[PDB]
Write a structure and sequence with these properties.
This is Cytosolic 5'-nucleotidase 3A. Its EC number is 3.1.3.5, 3.1.3.91. Belongs to the pyrimidine 5'-nucleotidase family. One of its GO terms (molecular function) is magnesium ion binding. There is one protein chain. The protein is α/β, with parallel strands linked by helices. It has 11 helices and 11 strands. The chain folds into 2 domains: about 190 residues, Rossmann fold; about 70 residues, Pyrimidine 5'-nucleotidase (UMPH-1), N-terminal domain (DNA polymerase, domain 1, Orthogonal Bundle). Helix content is about 40%, strand content about 15%. Strands 1-11-10-9-2-5-6 form a 7-stranded mixed sheet. The protein has a two-stranded antiparallel ribbon with strand order 3-4. A two-stranded antiparallel ribbon has the order 7-8. The radius of gyration is 19 Å and the shape is globular. The chain binds thymidine-5'-phosphate (TMP) and magnesium ion (MG). Thymidine-5'-phosphate (TMP) binds next to helix 2, helix 4 and strand 5.
Length: about 290
């Protein structure tokens, strides 16, 4: 049997579990299935990347562009102000999903309108990322390393920017063949200059939609009936809605902000909540027992 009490990673003060016996059972199920049955479905910004480091806020993939040298100061001020205004709505504990939804759509429209006007060149994304302050969570090498060693499918489902995200994991040496990225990917003109975004918008509250539009990916992993889902938002809880068959699913949520106001809700909807946690130690220990 699995005993969380015997696992010190689980007894750290940042680990909040509402139903420990159910988490035990779920983890026992993952262990029984092993590699052969495991897949990972994970958010990106503030789930695989850090929310803050040494007391300062770390950038999302969008923030990497907001802050980079390829954007004029005037634009950056506009972008900072949209961020202040729209982040406040995104995390607002008082507002329902349906109240927030149209403001999230609007944030993306305005942000992405301004980025297109700046004409970001594809060829500069590498430098922009290398000069950025982005940080992946502690333990990211062993997370991706262990998954790739056992050929475990990893689906990264991000409402961020796909090109930037890929470049971050590429520079960190963890963009392995088992990793699939679904995000908002830049459309470039004939000069390799940004003119728009491809496909349909993925935002904070419509991951259900793109989950169902990837049933090709999911129907090839029908045997991968044991799922570990990681997210930091309530909208991430929908990322596994396109999975073919679910036998055991464990949901791990990073609660990074408005902790006291959001804790009960997070504990009710995620199996394990990780409060102001900048490492992947908990999921790494699960992987260590499973693979
Ligand atoms: C549109 C926009 C979104 N974002 C955030 C909103 C979400 O929290 C996050 C989406 O990435 P995620 O789905 O990987 O967490 O990006 C910005 O930081 N800046 C922006 O301009
Ligand atoms: Mg996120």
């Amino acid at each position: 049997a699995v005993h969380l009490k015997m696992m010190p990673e689980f007894q750290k003060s940042s680990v909040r579990i509402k139903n420990p016996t159910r988490v035990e059972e779920i983890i026992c199920g993952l262990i029984k299935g092993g590699a052969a049955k495991l897949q990972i479905i994970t958010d990106f910004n503030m789930t695989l990347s850090r929310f803050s480091y040494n007391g300062k806020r770390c950038p999302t993939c969008h923030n990497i562009i907001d802050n980079c040298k390829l954007v004029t100061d005037e634009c950056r001020r506009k972008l900072l102000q949209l961020k202040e205004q729209y982040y406040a709505i995104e995390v607002d504990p008082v507002l329902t999903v349906e109240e927030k939804f149209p403001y999230m759509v609007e944030w993306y429209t305005k942000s992405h309108g301004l980025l297109i006007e700046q004409g970001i060149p594809k060829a500069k994304l590498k430098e922009i990322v290398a000069d950025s302050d982005v940080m992946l969570k502690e333990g990211y090498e062993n997370f991706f390393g262990k998954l790739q060693q056992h050929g475990i499918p990893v689906f990264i489902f991000s409402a961020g920017i796909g090109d930037v995200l890929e470049e971050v994991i590429r520079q960190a040496g963890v963009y392995h063949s088992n990793v699939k990225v679904v995000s908002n990917f830049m459309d470039f003109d004939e000069n390799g200059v940004l003119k728009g975004f491809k496909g349909e918008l993925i935002h904070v509250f419509n991951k259900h939609d793109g989950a169902l539009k990837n049933t090709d990916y999911f129907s090839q992993l029908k045997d991968n009936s044991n799922i570990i889902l990681l997210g930091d938002s309530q909208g991430d809880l929908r990322m596994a809605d396109g999975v073919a068959n679910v036998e055991h699913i464990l949901k791990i949520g990073y609660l990074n902000d408005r902790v006291d106001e959001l804790l009960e809700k997070y504990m009710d909807s995620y199996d394990i909540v990780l409060v102001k946690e900048e490492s992947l130690e908990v999921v790494n220990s699960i992987l260590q027992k499973t693979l």
